Amino acid sequence: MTEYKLVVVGAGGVGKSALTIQLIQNHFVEDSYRKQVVIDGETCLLDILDTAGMRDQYMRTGEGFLCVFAINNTKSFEDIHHYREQIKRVKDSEDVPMVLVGNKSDLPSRTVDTKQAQDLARSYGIPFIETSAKTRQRVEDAFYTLVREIRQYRLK
Ligand SMILES: NC1CCN(C2CCN(c3ncc4cc3C(=O)N([C@H]3CC[C@@H](N)CC3)CCCCCN3/C(=N/S4(=O)=O)Sc4c(Cl)ccc(O)c43)CC2)CC1
Ligand SMILES: Nc1nc2c(ncn2[C@@H]2O[C@H](COP(=O)(O)OP(=O)(O)NP(=O)(O)O)[C@@H](O)[C@H]2O)c(=O)[nH]1
Ligand SMILES: [Co+2]
Ligand SMILES: [Co+2]
Ligand SMILES: [Mg+2]
């Protein structure tokens, strides 16, 4: 049974922990969690690390990264450059499985346009998904897309 190490990264308060607990407990609220899931007929064990805003070690061990910003926090969006740069430096590769996640999609105070984030994700060559840990909207899609990015990378 294939095991995938997933790391959730992003600035303080963007909802890294809320996203992880929504995937695990299906509830809106340890730093590591495990969950066996079936994606495209293949069984796998997701091993998920929740981080703070061991850094080089988790960036080396992580197979895929959820780079999370909050749609109401422009600094958290700008700071994605910093998380993507540190990951690429440690992995010594311009190709690392990553998904850009715009969290708090439920909130009315949006300061980052969906279009702005989509264009950035297109510049990075990674998927972009808007999520809400509060309503569970696209939370599975974000983690499962990341597992699909790791599998596609493993066929390279
Ligand atoms: N509020 C903050 C509290 C502190 N958290 C940090 C706590 C220390 N962190 C660790 N970072 C990496 C390692 C172990 C620990 C680290 O010492 N821990 C300890 C686990 C037990 C206690 N809560 C103390 C933290 C975090 C769990 C490590 C789980 C195994 N692991 C890894 N082990 S590790 O490389 O030896 S890497 C890894 C990856 Cl990339 C994916 C999935 C994984 O399960 C994984 C990073 C997160 C971040 C959130
Ligand atoms: N409205 C809304 N609030 C959310 C959402 N996700 C998280 N929050 C809230 O945002 C705050 C920070 O969430 P948290 O999960 O702790 O974020 P974090 O990125 O893990 N924080 P830290 O870096 O300190 O560990 C909490 O008040 C949490 O309830 C969401 O999708 N929508
Ligand atoms: Co509760
Ligand atoms: Co830089
Ligand atoms: Mg947290």
Side-chain angles (χ1 to χ4, degrees):
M1 186 192 293
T2 311
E3 149 163 355
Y4 297 102
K5 300 252 202 325
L6 307 190
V7 187
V8 184
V9 299
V14 298
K16 296 179 299 289
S17 295
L19 280 170
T20 307
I21 298 160
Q22 192 54 279
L23 187 75
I24 302 301
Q25 305 186 1
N26 289 47
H27 184 70
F28 181 59
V29 63
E30 297 294 339
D31 39 15
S32 78
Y33 306 86
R34 279 148 288 270
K35 189 180 179 84
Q36 190 183 293
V37 289
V38 178
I39 302 175
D40 300 315
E42 178 172 18
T43 296
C44 59
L45 182 62
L46 302 191
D47 187 357
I48 303 170
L49 181 69
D50 184 22
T51 64
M54 299 307 292
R55 191 189 56 194
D56 279 23
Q57 181 57 43
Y58 69 64
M59 295 184 170
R60 208 169 279 112
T61 291
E63 293 162 339
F65 299 82
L66 273 195
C67 296
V68 187
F69 69 96
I71 57 129
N72 67 329
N73 176 356
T74 60
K75 175 189 182 295
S76 78
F77 175 72
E78 288 297 325
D79 284 350
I80 296 292
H81 163 95
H82 297 269
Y83 295 98
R84 170 169 168 281
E85 176 179 322
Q86 293 165 358
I87 292 158
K88 290 177 38 212
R89 183 174 289 110
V90 168
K91 294 191 95 67
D92 210 72
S93 178
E94 290 192 26
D95 192 9
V96 173
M98 294 192 196
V99 172
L100 183 67
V101 178
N103 194 39
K104 318 200 186 177
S105 71
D106 59 285
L107 282 189
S109 46
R110 166 187 299 276
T111 64
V112 180
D113 285 0
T114 306
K115 190 170 174 189
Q116 186 180 16
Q118 289 172 300
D119 291 331
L120 183 69
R122 273 200 274 276
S123 188
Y124 291 165
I126 68 179
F128 169 57
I129 302 164
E130 287 197 355
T131 61
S132 173
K134 169 173 269 236
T135 71
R136 193 184 200 261
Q137 191 80 52
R138 303 216 73 182
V139 175
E140 194 197 290
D141 295 339
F143 285 95
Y144 284 19
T145 296
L146 179 56
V147 171
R148 292 188 174 95
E149 285 295 291
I150 296 165
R151 289 173 170 181
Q152 186 173 355
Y153 175 80
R154 274 166 181 188
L155 302 197
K156 289 181 191 113

